[PDB]
Amino acid sequence: RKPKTGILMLNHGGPETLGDVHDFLLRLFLDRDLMTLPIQNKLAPFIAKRRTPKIQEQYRRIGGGSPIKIWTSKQGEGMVKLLDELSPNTAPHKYYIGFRYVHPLTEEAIEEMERDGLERAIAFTQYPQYSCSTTGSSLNAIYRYYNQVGRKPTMKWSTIDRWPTHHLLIQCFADHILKELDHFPLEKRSEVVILFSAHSLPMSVVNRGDPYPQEVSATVQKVMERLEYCNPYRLVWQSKVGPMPWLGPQTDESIKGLCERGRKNILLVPIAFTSDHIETLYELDIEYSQVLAKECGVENIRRAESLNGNPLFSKALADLVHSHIQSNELCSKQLTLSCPLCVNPVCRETKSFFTSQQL
Amino acid sequence: RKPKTGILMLNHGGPETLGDVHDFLLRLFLDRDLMTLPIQNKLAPFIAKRRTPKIQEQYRRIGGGSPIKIWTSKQGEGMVKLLDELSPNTAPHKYYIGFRYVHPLTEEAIEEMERDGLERAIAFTQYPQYSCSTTGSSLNAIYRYYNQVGRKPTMKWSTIDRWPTHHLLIQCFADHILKELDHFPLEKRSEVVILFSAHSLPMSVVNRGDPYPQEVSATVQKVMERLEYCNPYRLVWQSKVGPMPWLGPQTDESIKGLCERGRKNILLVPIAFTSDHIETLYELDIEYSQVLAKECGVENIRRAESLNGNPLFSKALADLVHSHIQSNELCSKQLTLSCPLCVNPVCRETKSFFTSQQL
Numbered sequence: 001r002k003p004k005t006g007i008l009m010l011n012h013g014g015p016e017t018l019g020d021v022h023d024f025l026l027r028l029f030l031d032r033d034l035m036t037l038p039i040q041n042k043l044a045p046f047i048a049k050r051r052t053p054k055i056q057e058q059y060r061r062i063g064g065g066s067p068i069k070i071w072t073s074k075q076g077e078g079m080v081k082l083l084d085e086l087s088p089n090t091a092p093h094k095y096y097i098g099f100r101y102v103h104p105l106t107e108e109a110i111e112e113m114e115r116d117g118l119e120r121a122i123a124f125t126q127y128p129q130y131s132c133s134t135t136g137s138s139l140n141a142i143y144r145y146y147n148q149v150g151r152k153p154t155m156k157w158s159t160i161d162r163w164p165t166h167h168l169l170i171q172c173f174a175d176h177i178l179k180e181l182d183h184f185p186l187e188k189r190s191e192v193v194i195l196f197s198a199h200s201l202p203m204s205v206v207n208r209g210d211p212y213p214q215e216v217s218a219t220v221q222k223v224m225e226r227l228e229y230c231n232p233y234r235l236v237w238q239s240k241v242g243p244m245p246w247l248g249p250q251t252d253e254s255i256k257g258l259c260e261r262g263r264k265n266i267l268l269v270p271i272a273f274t275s276d277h278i279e280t281l282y283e284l285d286i287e288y289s290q291v292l293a294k295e296c297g298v299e300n301i302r303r304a305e306s307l308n309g310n311p312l313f314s315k316a317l318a319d320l321v322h323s324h325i326q327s328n329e330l331c332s333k334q335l336t337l338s339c340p341l342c343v344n345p346v347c348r349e350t351k352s353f354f355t356s357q358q359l
Numbered sequence: 360r361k362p363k364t365g366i367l368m369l370n371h372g373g374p375e376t377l378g379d380v381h382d383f384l385l386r387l388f389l390d391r392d393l394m395t396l397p398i399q400n401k402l403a404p405f406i407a408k409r410r411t412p413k414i415q416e417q418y419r420r421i422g423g424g425s426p427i428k429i430w431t432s433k434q435g436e437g438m439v440k441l442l443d444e445l446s447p448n449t450a451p452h453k454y455y456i457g458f459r460y461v462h463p464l465t466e467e468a469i470e471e472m473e474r475d476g477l478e479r480a481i482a483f484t485q486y487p488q489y490s491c492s493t494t495g496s497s498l499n500a501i502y503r504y505y506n507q508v509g510r511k512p513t514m515k516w517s518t519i520d521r522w523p524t525h526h527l528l529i530q531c532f533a534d535h536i537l538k539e540l541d542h543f544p545l546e547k548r549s550e551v552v553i554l555f556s557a558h559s560l561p562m563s564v565v566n567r568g569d570p571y572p573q574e575v576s577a578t579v580q581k582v583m584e585r586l587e588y589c590n591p592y593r594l595v596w597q598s599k600v601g602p603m604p605w606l607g608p609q610t611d612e613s614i615k616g617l618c619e620r621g622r623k624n625i626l627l628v629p630i631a632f633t634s635d636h637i638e639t640l641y642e643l644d645i646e647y648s649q650v651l652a653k654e655c656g657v658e659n660i661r662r663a664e665s666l667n668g669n670p671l672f673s674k675a676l677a678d679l680v681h682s683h684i685q686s687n688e689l690c691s692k693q694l695t696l697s698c699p700l701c702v703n704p705v706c707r708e709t710k711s712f713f714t715s716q717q718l
């Protein structure tokens with residue numbers, strides 16, 4: 001029977017094959033929301049054509065593409081299965097995948113959602129900690145769609161735009177940390193240094209008032225509270241590119257640094273993503289734990305397992321939708337405040353769209 | 360009877376009267392734990408003489424000196440009053456102030472504590488969130504003291520080196536924030552934006568692994584949680600001095616931005632300090648609220664009152680000490696990890712000084 005409530009799961013692209021790498025980059029270089037370049041429509045097609053081989057090469061290094069869709073899918077099903085039991089008033093629930101930069105694109109998902117004649121649509125960011133350059137970019141795409149199509153939504157909307165401390169999210173991270181610790185030589189357990197590694201931001205974004213760091217930082221505290229401070233930690237940032245200043249310390253430097261100081265047992269915990277992707281399988285596992293770690297003489301370096309197929313995360317997702325629905329909330333309070341320095345007009349419009357929603 | 364357990368209360372401190380300003384800047388500028396100056400021993404006395412007028416001037420605009428000492432004193436007394444009741448086993452307790460840059464210097468307090476033959480000494484940072492440039496420097500001074508005097512301590516030492524999420528600390532902040540909201544026009548309560556404001560750090564420090572920003576962010580979350588996200592917020596940083604890059608956004612810049620974008624009801628919350636001082640009474644109340652707020656046409660700006668005399672803060676302090684004693688702890692787990700990139704040969708020495716303590 002007919003799907004009633006629709007859960008839009010938002011996330012950035014991940015090219016599924018080396019073939020999709022080009023269009024991936026192209027859509028990436030076109031997003032005003034994440035970068036203004038001179039004469040953008042002209043540069044992007046070229047920058048993409050230029051960086052395709054190297055990225056291809058990275059994906060090939062991890063087996064030939066991104067597993068983002070596969071994990072979102074399974075996490076999706078799990079969510080739906082549970083929601084259909086905890087919230088039966090919301091009839092059958094359906095999940096859709098709105099990726100920013102690869103198919104199914106956000107726009108395509110919305111088309112499919114409209115057509116299934118849903119009663120209510122929920123924008124569920126897959127980013128627990130809110131950045132304008134991630135969740136905001138995804139929220140903007142929804143608004144822009146309806147303002148490009150020219151008509152307007154035939155279903156009522158709302159957003160779960162952040163969830164950096166959801167209790168089951170935290171429990172998942174801790175569980176995966178505990179079990180990653182059990183694989184460390186028992187004589188070295190107490191001595192394991194934990195590095196929470198998050199995708200970095202450029203300072204120019206940080207300095208504009210982006211909430212990301214503060215949220216990532218909360219996530220980190222909650223986790224360590226639950227672990228009862230069993231090991232010393234730091235929060236470090238990865239994936240810097242370019243010559244500009246980014247928020248540090250860089251994860252590559254911290255690993256290198258810790259080593260030189262004789263802290264040679266390191267647990268990497270990727271705390272800002274809910275599944276594997278290039279950042280973990282290439283950046284962390286290959287560039288860092290295999291090349292870097294090696295030439296600095298680490299004793300042991302492990303990476304806590306991405307949430308991926310964990311059934312408990314699947315519960316987490318369901319529990320968030322459920323609560324969101326019951327609470328009748330349209331978005332978080334935080335969404336209703338733009339960053340005291342955006343130069344971007346759509347941020348207000350996009351937030352209007354969610355706070356102005358009927359019901 | 361004689362004092363059994365001493366509770367060393369560490370803080371930067373500030374000039375009590377205008378005359379202390381020169382000596383205050385002098386000791387700031389000679390502290391090779393936040394400053395490497397060419398021929399530092401000769402620039403410093405001078406930089407002091409040059410900056411003295413303007414800083415005196417600032418202190419004059421706030422009544423002619425810092426209250427850090429009065430308040431630390433009152434907190435000290437209340438703490439002791441309770442602790443004698445809470446832990447009679449640890450006999451009479453006595454507090455000492457050890458300021459870093461003004462009298463009573465860390466080193467004086469130490470001479471005194473030792474002169475009263477205490478069985479133990481607790482280094483109790485009054486900065487809830489750890490920075491290498493604040494609590495660390497205070498800890499470095501204790502270790503350095505013994506290395507200088509060339510003797511060993513006659514009392515058993517330990518430390519409460521951080522406490523960013525103490526339940527009562529959090530509770531006091533919540534209370535003070537609520538109290539301040541009832542002072543805003545009622546028609547505007549739930550439109551008020553909360554700007555948590557904290558002393559900034561130079562990126563060069565952030566970038567070497569300083570724990571502070573992540574700890575400050577943690578404190579913010581706990582306060583907002585307990586407030587039940589009743590108002591939008593941002594975490595922002597104040598007190599940038601110089602041409603170098605600091606962690607932003609800057610508090611001032613953020614206030615102006617908010618104003619230029621129609622958010623004209625701001626509550627400042629000083630989240631990284633336990634009492635009033637220059638940062639709050641001059642920077643926040645005068646520079647930002649009284650001047651900046653007029654040129655950018657704010658409607659209402661307000662500041663949550665510093666913890667100062669709050670009786671519940673005193674209870675907060677006692678709980679911390681008492682729990683630290685019951686727990687038998689030498690330091691936080693977090694102190695045992697120096698920040699992955701420091702270049703300061705002393706951090707590990709200090710750390711060892713506390714992790715290595717007898718009893």
Ligand code: HEM
Pocket residue numbers: 012028034035051055131133134199200201202205241272273277278279
């Ligand atoms: C304004 C802020 C951001 C900017 C400017 C930015 C920039 C970029 C750039 C240049 C790439 C291409 C990667 C490369 O060519 O080396 C990329 C890809 C990517 N971005 Fe972001 N990023 C931002 C924030 C984030 C955050 C916080 C995340 C968290 C997951 C994220 C997720 C990803 C992922 C998974 C890729 C794959 C890129 C690749 O496979 O090479 N982005 N971004």
Ligand code: HEM
Pocket residue numbers: 371373387393410414486490492493558559560561564600631636637638
């Ligand atoms: C490397 C780290 C830091 C550096 C290099 C630094 C620099 C300075 C400077 C230059 C002054 C004198 C004011 C001036 O000369 O304009 C000062 C004083 C002061 N510091 Fe810092 N600061 C740092 C971190 C912090 C932090 C995190 C806090 C509190 C959390 C703090 C608390 C204070 C206070 C209350 C004053 C009094 C300033 C005055 O009276 O003018 N400092 N520091």
Ligand SMILES: C[C@H](CCC(=O)O)[C@H]1CC[C@H]2[C@@H]3[C@H](O)C[C@@H]4C[C@H](O)CC[C@]4(C)[C@H]3C[C@H](O)[C@]12C
Pocket residue numbers: 034035036037047051202204241242243244
């Ligand atoms: C990574 C890429 C360089 C591609 C290459 O030559 O390999 C560069 C070129 C243009 C860059 C972007 C542009 O400089 C615009 C943005 C400006 C901000 O100050 C930094 C981030 C910012 C969002 C940049 C991210 C990244 O460094 C980009 C995308």
Ligand SMILES: C[C@H](CCC(=O)O)[C@H]1CC[C@H]2[C@@H]3[C@H](O)C[C@@H]4C[C@H](O)CC[C@]4(C)[C@H]3C[C@H](O)[C@]12C
Pocket residue numbers: 036037038043047
């Ligand atoms: C200064 C400017 C960013 C302007 C802005 O942020 O508004 C920079 C950032 C990214 C740069 C471009 C990208 O790096 C891609 C190209 C790479 C070449 O190495 C230089 C030219 C190239 C075409 C760059 C031109 C120019 O230097 C850009 C456009």
Ligand SMILES: C[C@H](CCC(=O)O)[C@H]1CC[C@H]2[C@@H]3[C@H](O)C[C@@H]4C[C@H](O)CC[C@]4(C)[C@H]3C[C@H](O)[C@]12C
Pocket residue numbers: 394395396397406
């Ligand atoms: C380059 C050096 C910073 C050294 C460092 O990286 O630690 C800077 C920072 C502070 C500077 C000094 C102090 O600001 C005091 C003086 C102020 C005058 O404006 C210039 C000369 C003056 C005597 C400065 C000389 C020099 O440019 C210093 C010493």
Ligand SMILES: C[C@H](CCC(=O)O)[C@H]1CC[C@H]2[C@@H]3[C@H](O)C[C@@H]4C[C@H](O)CC[C@]4(C)[C@H]3C[C@H](O)[C@]12C
Pocket residue numbers: 393394395406409410561563600601602603
């Ligand atoms: C405040 C004073 C400038 C006063 C003047 O010249 O009139 C200067 C002299 C030395 C400076 C410091 C030194 O350059 C060393 C520190 C290093 C960081 O990169 C900046 C903060 C840092 C702590 C500086 C802050 C501030 O600008 C200081 C303290």
Ligand code: FES
Pocket residue numbers: 132136209210337338339341342343344347
């Ligand atoms: S860029 Fe953060 S709200 Fe506009």
Ligand code: FES
Pocket residue numbers: 491495568569696697698701702703706707
């Ligand atoms: S500077 Fe942080 S431990 Fe040395």
Ligand SMILES: [Cl-]
Pocket residue numbers: 013014015066067068276277278279
């Ligand atoms: Cl990926």
Ligand SMILES: [Cl-]
Pocket residue numbers: 372373374425426427635636637638
């Ligand atoms: Cl002061």
